[PDB]
Amino acid sequence: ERASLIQKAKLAEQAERYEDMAAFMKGAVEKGEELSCEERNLLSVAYKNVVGGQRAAWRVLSSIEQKSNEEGGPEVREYREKVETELQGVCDTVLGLLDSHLIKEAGDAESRVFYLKMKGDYYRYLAEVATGDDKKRIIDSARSAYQEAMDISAAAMPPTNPIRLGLALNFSVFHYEIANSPEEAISLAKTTFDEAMADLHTLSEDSYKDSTLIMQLLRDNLTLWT
């Protein structure tokens, strides 16, 4: 059953049907076996494409809503609330899978950092659209997931590792955009980037391409934030 669901998720990826891919991957995770590096990536690709589409849509509507509070309707608010609801459901699904199946005390630091970063990410996506005391709870949950992942990655992974680089990038986005700590965001992005150039020669063609891409992102964000 699990092997079939993974094959179907690979087919859904080829067909670019990410909602289907996510559903197959959810089912595969629910079989109870640990995910391989390839399978983790299938799960991540599936849900990031679903949530990414929803997040991109919400910003368009939220921007129209913010602009239409000049020159003069309610349909924007009602519809923004609907999508927002769809986005919240996808984040809650991912977070549910992470907490009930994927987040474990064992084994590899790579897989542990991967899932904890994913937890921080989906809480951060919830924080992008959250409002009151709920927003505060969500911000705290993202911060905790990211910090636990940072502690593991600094102790177990080299500074050029793409999972470590990607995590530090997202946590710095969190500090700047969500937690409104631009200084912490700039400091984290600078440190991550600096610790990276010094270690690039230790990387293989595969790892090198991952780090060199992500360092460009850190640098672009620093250009934008400073």
């Binding site: 991540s44 690709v45 955009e177 992500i214 672009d220 250009t223």
Partner: protein
Amino acid sequence: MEIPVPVQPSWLRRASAPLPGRLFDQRFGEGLLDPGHFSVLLDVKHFSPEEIAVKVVGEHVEVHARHEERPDEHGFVAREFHRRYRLPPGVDPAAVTSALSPEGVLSIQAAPA
């Protein structure tokens, strides 16, 4: 008489974790895989916005890109280039703007004057 042209990154938002030619300098392309105006496209792939300087020096638009020694695929590499373009007569030097795309394309433009 010379005025500095600011290099503004075209892209706004911010980049998060992504889904995981040759070693030359520049020119122009039709796409990624005259009146009183100015419009040029430059490939500045090896330089960050802070490593590119655009100026209007008299009758010319100057582009000065430089990056200090950095690691790459084969070893270490430092690069530097200086490009110069003529500014047509009916173009106001104050109207000259510059932007850098996330793809690494530098566009220097000046609205018709």
